[PDB]
Design a protein around this ligand. Sequence first.
Ligand SMILES: CCCC(=O)SCCNC(=O)CCNC(=O)[C@H](O)C(C)(C)COP(=O)(O)OP(=O)(O)OC[C@H]1O[C@@H](n2cnc3c(N)ncnc32)[C@H](O)[C@@H]1OP(=O)(O)O
Ligand SMILES: [Cl-]
Ligand SMILES: [Zn+2]
Lengths: 276, 28
Amino acid sequence: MIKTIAFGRYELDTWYHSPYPEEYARLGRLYMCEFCLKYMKSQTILRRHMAKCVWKHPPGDEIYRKGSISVFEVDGKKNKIYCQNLCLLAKLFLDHKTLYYDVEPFLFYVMTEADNTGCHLIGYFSKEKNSFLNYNVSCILTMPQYMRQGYGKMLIDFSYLLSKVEEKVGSPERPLSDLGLISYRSYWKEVLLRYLHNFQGKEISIKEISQETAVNPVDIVSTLQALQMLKYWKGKHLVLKRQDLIDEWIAKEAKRSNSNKTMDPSCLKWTPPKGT
Amino acid sequence: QGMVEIEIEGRLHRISIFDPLEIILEDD
Ligand SMILES: CCCC(=O)SCCNC(=O)CCNC(=O)[C@H](O)C(C)(C)COP(=O)(O)OP(=O)(O)OC[C@H]1O[C@@H](n2cnc3c(N)ncnc32)[C@H](O)[C@@H]1OP(=O)(O)O
Ligand SMILES: [Cl-]
Ligand SMILES: [Zn+2]
């Protein structure tokens, strides 16, 4: 049963089982092309593949580029094989993954970091092409060798950037895993404290914050509760602008900029696909 | 008809999404 993956220059321990064919799942170690995501049986087979494989980046359209960081929009109907490979690969680290086979109704936003050999996979999020529940993320992953460096938050931030450009309010697909809820709560806090740090008025509505940030009103209210910023005095509810919370936020956001782990809206060249 | 429920300091509450809410610093 599958225990590790060879992926470019990394060797990755798998968290959960993924339904690779038994011919492969029978092995303990699976070899992957880091660019087209084909899975193979041995180092030897991979080496032969790497001599033949033309791909040096995801398929699809590069819609974000800031220096060495890119995001590629892959259509699951146009690149079924790549997206299915991506889906089997993500299930090695997702406890509960929506689906694997029918990738056609989904778009995949694949984030990469470039060096002189090509555009290497950092992570991705999928997104329903047409979601009744207005979910702007279906699943999201940062590859293990990249985890806990701020790329997950860039992926989340990017998913809301798409929503803004579509003039939509978005929300992640329920249910949220523990790692996902921690990351979303961190992002929501950042976005809420940033808005309030910049707003000079003395009253605001949830809808106003929601329409500016593309964040859903319920998650806004939920973050306000988590921050203990919803108080009750006399008859109505008030927002408590906690000094420390924004004080810690400017110190934290200083460190974020310093490390360049931010998405930059002016680096997005994108018009929403096949729905506008 | 967009409203949210939860509790603040042992008190169940209910909040509108369109009503302006007042921002404060540290007064009472
Ligand atoms: C969303 C629709 C429904 C779903 O699919 S939910 C499933 C989400 N995906 C998964 O669970 C797959 C496994 N996990 C992941 O891929 C990543 O952990 C995930 C959720 C993308 C986060 O990616 P990262 O690149 O690590 O995130 P990041 O560096 O931007 O930091 C985000 C905040 O989360 C925190 N955190 C991140 N990893 C943690 C960990 N192991 N244990 C405890 N806390 C953790 C991290 O410190 C950061 O918080 P903060 O800014 O310091 O307050
Ligand atoms: Cl390089
Ligand atoms: Zn390949």
